[PDB]
Amino acid sequence: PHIDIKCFPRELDEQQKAALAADITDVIIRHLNSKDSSISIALQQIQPESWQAIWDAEIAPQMEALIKKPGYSMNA
Amino acid sequence: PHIDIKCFPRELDEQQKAALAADITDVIIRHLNSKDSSISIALQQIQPESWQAIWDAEIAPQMEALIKKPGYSMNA
Ligand SMILES: O=C([O-])/C(F)=C\c1ccc(O)cc1
Ligand SMILES: O=C([O-])/C(F)=C\c1ccc(O)cc1
């Protein structure tokens, strides 16, 4: 599986990115019956002013199918 | 944060989807210091014949930047 994480900017060093990836990996292995070798993970830091584009392209159109819906709304 | 999970087709029921979302949520809360309300999660099933397009758009061009690189390769 390929996991993409989008978030607002924060200071995250390589040890912190690796620890995040490890914990995501364990969850994916246990829930999707995956193998470590099949898992890839991207982390993309998006400035808050550009979050509306993520809402419009990714979040809102998929509201009917999201496995976890946001606790906020940004329809413009 | 917005998390997108792309994987091959699988039978997943409502309880399974919600448990996967909750384990992902807690990992994001731990590593990104996020609030529950800011987290959204998508699960997109991709047919195996369409995985090369995911590799070409999301994995290969971002290879060095990935926080977890794939153990497999589509360019051997
Ligand atoms: O959590 C994040 O870093 C983010 F990308 C977006 C977000 C969305 C809604 C909020 O209330 C807070 C942050
Ligand atoms: O894990 C998945 O469900 C997937 F979308 C692709 C994949 C990639 C490499 C593998 O070895 C197995 C599956």
The residues spanned by each domain of chain B are 1-64
Q: Which ligand is nearest to the CA of B44?
A: 2
β-pair partners for B40? B2
Amino acid at A50: S
Instruction: Name the helix (H) or strand (E) containing B63.
Output: none
Joined tokens for residue A65: 């199918």
CB-nearest to B3 from A5, A8, A72 is A5
Distance CA B62, CA B68 (A): 11
Pocket of ligand 1 (CB under 6 A): A 6-8, 46, 51, 72; B 1, 34, 37-38
DSSP state of B67: S
Bridge partner list, B68: A41
Classify A29 as helix, strand or coil.
helix
What resolution, expressed in A, was reported for this entry?
1.4
Q: Are B18 and B2 in contact (CB under 8 A)?
A: no
* HSE-up (13 A, CA, CB side) for residue B11: 0
The span from the CA of B67 to the CA of B48, in Å, is 23
> What is chain A's Cα-based Rg?
14
A1-64, CATH topology level: Macrophage Migration Inhibitory Factor (3.30.429)
Q: Which amino acid is at B65?
A: A
Q: How many CB pairs under 8 A join A and B?
A: 130
Give the nearest chain B residue to A14 (CA atoms): B67
A70 is catalytic: no
Specify whether the CB–CB gap between A69 and A63 falls below 8 A: yes
State the distance between the two ends of chain A, measured CA to CA, in whole angstroms.
32
- Identify the experimental approach: X-ray
Q: Which residues contact B19 (CB under 8 A, 6 or more apart)?
A: A31
Bridge partners, B6 (sequence order): A2, B44
Q: Which DSSP string corresponds to chain B?
A: -EEEEEES-----HHHHHHHHHHHHHHHHHHH---GGG-EEEEEE--GGGHHHHIIIIIGGGGGG-SB--SS-S--
